[PDB]
Amino acid sequence: RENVPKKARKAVRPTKLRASLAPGTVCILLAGRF
RNA sequence: UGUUUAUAGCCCUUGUUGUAAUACGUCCACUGGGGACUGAGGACUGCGGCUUGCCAAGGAUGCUGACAUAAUGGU
Q1: Where in the cell is it found?
Q2: How many angstroms separate the CA of A26 from the C1' of B50?
Q3: Is A32's CB less than 7 Å from nucleic acid strand B?
């Protein structure tokens, strides 16, 4: 019956990064191999 | 022991600095974050907003990963 998905009203917008995450900042890695 | 700001000061009233501050009550169709649960519906209609179009506006989508010899679900 070829169910067509309804037109979702979600659109992608830029992520609002944290204030303290400025470029050129020292930071600690919390996961991964490093 | 007794006295009246002196070599400490205190209390009361008024003026002033004053439209003083603050506490508190209340309101903002003011705003900035953190966490959890949920994704029902299934072309288009509607009510709105910004401007043919776009949108947070009649219910989730997007970007990725890992794993299939296991993860999940069981019995």
Answers
A1: Cytoplasm; Nucleus; Nucleus, Nucleolus
A2: 41
A3: no
